[PDB]
Write a protein that binds this ligand. Structure first.
Ligand SMILES: OC[C@H]1O[C@@H](O)[C@H](O)[C@@H](O)[C@H]1O
Ligand SMILES: OC[C@H]1O[C@@H](O)[C@H](O)[C@@H](O)[C@H]1O
Ligand SMILES: OC[C@H]1O[C@@H](O)[C@H](O)[C@@H](O)[C@H]1O
Ligand SMILES: OC[C@H]1O[C@@H](O)[C@H](O)[C@@H](O)[C@H]1O
Lengths: 989, 989
């Protein structure tokens, strides 16, 4: 049996169950004075479709290069025209038959030439901080070894192989390997050398690894310091210095520092330090803090903390898995600016530079190992690597490298074994290894609800209801009494919650109230921080984001990648603006009589000395009063009542009733910080004096009659239809009832529970809410006042093939100045379809106007959108925006931009202005129709058609988080019902 | 309360529950010598969007016409650019709130000027044979009345209103009315005056109505004749004459004719007749036949008959509901040419000219009333007009007019109350009325399974299994013993079965065998005769059919309209070719030794004297023998063994074994008939001498080896992939396994039963059968014979995210002339997905070739396609066709064109020819890919890409009728399994 296949040897290596070979022991990423040369820059690159046709020519030596072109390094090579991105959620892009790999497997050959000076001898190494997913490395033709673990560091000794002067480094990178089976994160598949490549010397009498142990005794205030140092795995002599604390001690010994200032996300105190031996010195930043679990609470420095967190993937719209440092610093400052205090590195270790920034700015970090086997769930977890003993060594290695690299950073308060990888013996081995190596950080893993091998109980997307049961410690018991006992003593954290995809997330406040009420609840991490949008440039310079499927992939999960609080360029979504308010660290309850406000300090450690408390009274015209009030600092977890100047209460008392006015109290930064300038807003509260009920016009104008038209003051009606065609000279091309909106991403998902497995969008489509039809029943003019008349138009709205409907009556009235419009809705028949009760998106009206709108003004909530279960961040005030800025640039267009709680509005159409008033309504204005919005898959598919689509809603439905997790909560649902609402219009030129 | 709405009076009339007003009594359509003038021609026409804007100007008088243009009459006015067609299946296109109508309701004003000569006085009438759906008629400004019942005749007296000379006739037609609620047939909605408009004089002493009663005593052979005649509802004096029978008798008296030749679809004997009084004479055609039910059988003239039927809608691709007479005669001849003997006028009376043609050519007709309320089912039948007493008069009227018009035609053997209209008191009133008026024809209605008010038990799409239970009279009992007793004594008919949508129908033979075995089974009517395709002409002159949705309708049911045995232009689909064979009236079983054949006469009345029995022996070269054999006529329902000339058996006996040869016996017409010429084929049978097993080549050629290629005789392989790239100079761009085909219309429907409600196409999509991926495992050359070698390529086929797969091994061998190819398939893992066992469409191979193919030849079954549960009409022989004629022009492209039972094949590519041989396989050749075929929604979306896609299948799955009714029967399913098949190839230039 002759064997004639090509590349069988390269494939066997890619199919290996083992960790990479030929590498130095795993250690910490350390700032050293040892000489170093970054090989980052312009490399040469060649791509083959698979191993069997990957040329075995002499390319590794660098001479006679055939078929190479320039490429930057680090890089995600699909970001530069070589192949294309492919995004899948749970599903693998290849056949599930481990350890085998497909035949279509991009192979990337990388090569660079560099100069090695004398200072890199006799000893040196090469360091690779990230290769996705399988790398083989040669130096001057000699093989160093292989890399496994795509976001993990590898180091190769080049002593006696690195030559003085010019050297040639070659790296072969395969996209898919056996390791892909354990790297099934929901994100873009992006092969490449995507992190630093560095040459580092290792002088004699140096330092290879360091392990900081900096604890805090919260009773005495002492610091407990012990800095370990080793060479070749052996503890060595070395001296530690921290100038600020008047300390010089030996490595390996534990000392009590009489008084330290503890480290926390709120106060990230960092003492500079150096560990030095004869040949090498290491620069450290040390944060004193101790982590402990007691009374079923997660405590730092003796206090239960509340995690205000997000899940952070690493992604950049033009460079993929390469995130420039300027972008890292930016987004982390942006996080702090929105009151975030915690980060989960979903689902792999980040760039090693991330850790120091986290220590400095202040975040509680859950550092997570690179491991996820989600794609094995659909087959009942059969062949899951997490329980296959042949994978033990490879998975322990992943955890080892994860722990060693970042074990010195005070910001890491939990080690996480991975994400959605089931349960198995290998996961238990990873946990046992970590607990032995570093018992100073509790262990996290959500995949095993029994929680046998962890220290905190973690779940994702648990309902508000179950969260409250857990907060009270009365969730259902595990069958094993011993394991149930353990878990009931564990604090609870939501590693992912309030899925922030598209319009939403809804129901954040409900979670937060539980967090504040129940100590056992640690808090939660929003999924997720950013949208993984990829910029696509088109003809005429139009720029938009692409998502799953837009790059010609055979298997994908669509727009699930754009599920973030900010877009790929870090521009806030409305959800982040709401999130900031929900998690605000201070609560300000302004008194109704404007005499003062209650101030609760929600922080865990800091008092209120960093904040300046300011007040301002705003009214119709401008601002009437304002200033700053001094507050004796308030301790954490306590409250006080702050008096306001009597002048404020006097304004309120002498306010002619019916005049609108808003008192706003804010807590801003008194001075610059590392993450924001002075005056940055942190918390706020308001008290509103509402405008009185709008005076309904006197019906003293009669109805003129003609053959095909009616007129009632500034309004013109069509006799045939009964609907306005003009108001004050403004063409009304249509007016009608609305019960539907263009489905959100959440409306496109299932609400599990109940016998109805259809998404809300499908329920609506089956019911006909998107294609309503109106029948005219009657037109009638009725006696008004002193000659005038009202005009009642009676209609019935329904849909083809349906028997249910609603009766809508429009009653118009006018005095010549302002048009009054009453609308009555009455449901007719039983609103059931395919055996389930139909629900409504809204109860409102759609005005279609023939003119374009330039500007929208309103008194209500703003500046940004607000729906019944969102809008926490929208405050009471006066707002005005150009039309285009009323919209929201979601990647898949969908319902958005409604302004709930509006009392008045004003649209500028050319030279005229249309004013709407009435009891609280929601306001939306768009230059396109609802059907155009529902059809559009990307922003370019939206086109203005010269009209103005105006929406005035009396009732609205919530948005929820049904795309992943709970749907709209009961209190925000909208069942069919009768309704009645009044409204006044006016046009002025 | 002033009332200001427009058109409220016209709308109230459209909402009327009552029949049309002001019309003459319902009567028969009669050929009379009274003067007549057809007003058909070029009319003037105007369209308004609704009643409220329909002008009330002076248009009815004909002077100062504003906005009218020319339009033909009769017409379906959406067929001429006024609006557009809209097709819905079950669902109404308007809100379901009877009797109300929508505001978007096209109003069509029609007008013509004509001359009335002296012979139209003093009495005359105007006759309208069809107006959809509500007409108001004026003559010279004077209102005559209104029409209700869209396919029913109305007559209006114009005495004292018709003026001598020039007259002006005006008709206002509304598309939607209260009557639309009872005209919910599955078809295009097409308003208009779509049938004849005729002026007819009514001289004094004339004849208004006639009622023929022509029975047959099958014991004596006597005819029982009684011709009734009436004027103004009163029986009158009149004399009846039938020359051929030597008869002159008075109307109203019953006589025994000593000897008549009975009428039947097989022998449609018609005696000419005339009923005459002083002023008028009527021409009649009389067929003597008596209908009776006894021993739970449906009998004509004392014999149980077998219905070979189709459901006939009226439709024309360019004129809509207007079917020219030349097209009627054509399609009915086409029906007879395919052995059909029965017609159901689904679901309304046809054009009155249809009846005479049915009497002449010979069909058993189920004449069905215009009534269907299907759209009320989705709401639990609430508000169903069939049980609403306010609709009684309007529904009795529909049945009255239905019965009166056609009561004289022997071809009508059943009256049908309507279709899918539920159960209700009005349906019972329609039945009571019919039984009293005409007790000579049993009553049919499927909507009430209890069968309380009918004479035959009717069902639609009952499984073969339930049909067999009913054939034995052991179906489950009704709860009411008295009704169960009645129904068990009733014969059973399938008014709709073997849904003929797209590829199919499958499972026809199984039904037919039950029809022949069980007397209680009357037979069945295929759904349906024609596709309702509408021709759409595009730039460059390309012509294709449109279906539901292609005309911009808001609500539609897609391609369900193209569900016919022939296309809109009456070109046969493969299903009709199979249907003809299944229902063939004679069975011919040719003996294996070629000594003779068994002949069963399946007819009910006629013997075999009309047929000439002919034989022919065909072989490789040409024909070897042939002739005609004389058969003593065989009586109905008996059989005989016909000897063939000894010369035929001698050829078979002296045939060198392994040589293929086919003996075919045919029954053709001995002489011309009214529906076909002499030599037309009616029945056939065959005996085949198969070719011997193909000799596998001697493996005496070795494997040449190169860096990137292997070669084994005329074959070139790629070392990387292991797959052919050449055979004899022909580029092979790809070769691989197939388990999937582009879903048929049947595959897009649900198979109710079992916990899996997904259509087969969705099951396949979820499982990944459409996106298979192959991994190379090994390549190996093995010792052959006298130096030669075999080449085994080992592969594993699967799909992304799936663990199941198949192992496919290709073993090649050659002697230099012919390539031998063995293929072994072994399933690997459990083929389950989303909790249900995956099924396969096929087990085969796809050859993709770089050259185009001009011609395809094969020995097997043809000329037309054949799948496991179809192809009855495909016979054994030798066939050759240009590539384009191997395809099938279904309106929605889908899997089709496979040739099952193939033993050899030959493709001509330019100058060369590729030959395939082996054990029985299925052959398909296309100029495009399977994905292009699945994506295409219409024919133009198919584009040849310069390649040749060749499919060789070892196993195939059935097609069934799951689009509506049973899916693939158990024995034709294809579960995943191991398989093995051999095959030889050869290229000759
Ligand atoms: O103590 C106040 C601060 O608390 C931090 O945890 C948060 O990240 C900051 O944005 C700020 O709110
Ligand atoms: O092994 C994976 C499973 O683990 C269980 O603890 C959990 O309840 C399941 O939902 C699933 O995640
Ligand atoms: O008796 C033979 C004939 O029977 C008729 O019913 C049929 O319509 C004809 O096509 C032919 O088959
Ligand atoms: O009233 C309509 C119903 O009539 C019943 O006899 C039948 O079983 C049902 O399927 C439905 O057709």
């Amino acid at each position: 049996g002759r064997s004639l296949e090509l590349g069988a040897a390269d494939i066997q290596d890619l199919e290996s169950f083992e960790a990479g070979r030929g590498a130095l022991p795993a250690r910490a990423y350390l700032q050293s004075d040892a000489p170093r040369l970054s090989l980052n820059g312009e490399w040469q690159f060649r791509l083959s479709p698979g191993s069997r046709v990957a040329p075995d020519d002499g390319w590794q030596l660098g001479e006679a290069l055939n078929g190479f072109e320039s490429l930057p390094v680090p890089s995600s090579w699909p970001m530069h025209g070589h192949g294309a991105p492919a995004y899948t959620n749970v599903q693998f892009p290849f056949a599930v038959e481990p350890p085998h790999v497909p035949e279509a497997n991009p192979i990337g050959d990388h090569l660079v030439v560099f100069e090695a000076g004398p200072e890199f001898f006799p000893h040196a190494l090469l360091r690779f901080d990230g290769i996705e997913s399988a790398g083989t490395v040669w130096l001057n033709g000699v093989e160093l070894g292989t890399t496994r673990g795509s976001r993990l560091a590898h180091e190769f000794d080049v002593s006696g192989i690195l030559e003085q002067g010019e050297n040639t480094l070659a790296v072969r990178v395969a996209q898919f390997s056996a390791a892909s089976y354990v790297e099934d994160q929901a994100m873009w598949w992006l092969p490449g050398i995507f992190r630093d490549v560095t040459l580092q010397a290792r002088p004699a009498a140096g330092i290879d690894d360091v392990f900081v142990h900096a604890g805090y005794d919260h009773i005495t205030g002492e610091g407990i310091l012990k800095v370990e140092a080793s060479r070749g795995g052996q503890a060595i002599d070395a001296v530690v210095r921290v100038p600020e604390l008047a300390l010089e001690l030996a490595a390996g010994t534990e000392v009590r520092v009489p008084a330290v200032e503890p480290w926390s996300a709120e106060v990230p105190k960092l003492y500079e330090a150096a560990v030095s031996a004869a040949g090498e010195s290491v620069a450290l930043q040390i944060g004193f803090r101790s982590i402990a679990i007691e009374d079923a609470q997660f405590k730092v420095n003796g206090r239960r903390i509340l995690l205000r967190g997000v899940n952070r993937h690493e992604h950049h719209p033009r460079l993929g898995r390469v995130v420039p440092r300027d972008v890292v610093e930016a987004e982390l400052r942006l996080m702090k600016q929105h009151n975030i205090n915690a980060i989960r590195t979903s689902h792999y270790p980040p760039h090693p530079q991330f850790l120091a920034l986290a220590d400095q700015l202040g975040f509680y970090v859950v550092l997570e190992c690179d491991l996820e086997t989600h794609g094995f769930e659909s087959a009942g977890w059969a062949q899951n690597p997490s329980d296959d003993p042949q994978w033990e060594d490879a998975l322990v290695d992943r955890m080892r490298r994860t722990v060693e690299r970042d074990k010195n950073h005070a910001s890491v308060v939990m080690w996480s074994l991975g994400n959605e990888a089931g349960t198995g013996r290998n996961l238990a081995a990873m946990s046992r290894w970590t607990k032995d190596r570093d018992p100073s950080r509790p262990i996290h893993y959500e995949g095993d609800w029994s929680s046998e091998h962890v220290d905190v109980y973690s779940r994702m997307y648990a309902s508000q209801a179950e969260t409250a049961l857990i907060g009270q410690g009365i969730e259902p018991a595990l069958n094993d009494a011993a394991l149930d006992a353990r878990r009931r003593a564990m604090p609870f954290v939501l590693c992912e919650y309030v899925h922030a995809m598209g319009n939403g997330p809804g129901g954040m406040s409900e979670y937060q109230a539980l967090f504040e009420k129940y100590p056992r609840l640690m808090g939660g991490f929003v999924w997720e921080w950013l949208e993984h949008g990829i910029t696509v440039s088109t003809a005429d310079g139009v720029d938009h984001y692409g998502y799953g499927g837009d790059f010609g992939e055979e298997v994908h999960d669509g727009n699930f990648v754009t599920d973030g609080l900010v877009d790929a360029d870090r521009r806030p979504r409305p959800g982040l603006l709401d999130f900031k308010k929900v998690i605000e660290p201070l609560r300000i309850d302004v008194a109704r009589d404007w005499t003062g406000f209650t101030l609760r300090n929600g922080q865990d450690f800091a008092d209120t000395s960093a904040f300046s408390f300011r007040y301002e009274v705003e009214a119709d015209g401008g601002a009437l009063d304002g200033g700053t009030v001094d507050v004796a600092p308030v301790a954490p977890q306590s409250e006080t009542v702050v008096e306001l100047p009597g002048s404020v209460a006097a304004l309120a008392a002498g306010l002619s009733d019916g005049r609108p006015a808003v008192l706003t109290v804010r807590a801003v930064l008194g001075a610059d910080s590392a993450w924001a300038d002075a005056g940055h807003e942190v918390a706020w509260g308001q008290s509103v004096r509402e405008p009185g009920a709008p005076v309904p016009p006197a019906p003293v104008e009669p109805v003129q009659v003609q053959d095909s038209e009616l007129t009632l003051g500034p309004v013109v009606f069509s006799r045939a239809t009964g609907m306005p065609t003009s108001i004050g000279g403004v063409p009304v091309e249509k007016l009608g009832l609305t019960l539907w909106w263009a489905p959100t991403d959440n409306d496109l998902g299932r609400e599990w529970g109940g016998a109805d497995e259809r998404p809300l969008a499908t329920q609506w489509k089956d019911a006909g809410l998107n294609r309503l039809h109106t029948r005219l029943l009657g037109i009638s003019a009725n006696p008004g006042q002193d000659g005038g008349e009202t005009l009642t138009v009676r209609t019935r709205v329904s849909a083809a093939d349906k028997q249910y409907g609603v009766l809508v009556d429009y009653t118009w009235s006018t005095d010549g100045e302002t048009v009054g419009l009453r609308t009555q809705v009455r449901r007719d028949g039983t609103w059931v379809n395919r055996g389930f009760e139909v629900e409504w998106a809204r109860i409102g009206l759609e005005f279609v106007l023939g003119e374009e709108t330039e500007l929208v003004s309103w008194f209500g909530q703003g500046p940004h959108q607000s729906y019944p279960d969102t809008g926490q961040g929208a405050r009471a005030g006066w707002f005005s925006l150009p039309l285009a800025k009323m919209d929201v640039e979601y990647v898949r267009p969908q319902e958005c931009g409604a302004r709930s709680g509006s009392r008045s509005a004003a649209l500028q159409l050319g030279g005229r202005t249309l004013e709407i008033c009435g009891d609280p309504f929601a306001l939306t204005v768009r230059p396109y129709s609802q059907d155009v919005l529902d059809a559009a898959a990307h922003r370019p598919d939206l086109k203005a058609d010269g009209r103005t689509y105006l929406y005035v809603d009396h009732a609205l439905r919530g948005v929820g988080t049904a795309a992943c997790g709970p749907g709209v909560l009961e209190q925000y649902r909208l069942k069919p019902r009768d309704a009645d609402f009044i409204l006044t219009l006016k046009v002025r030129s």
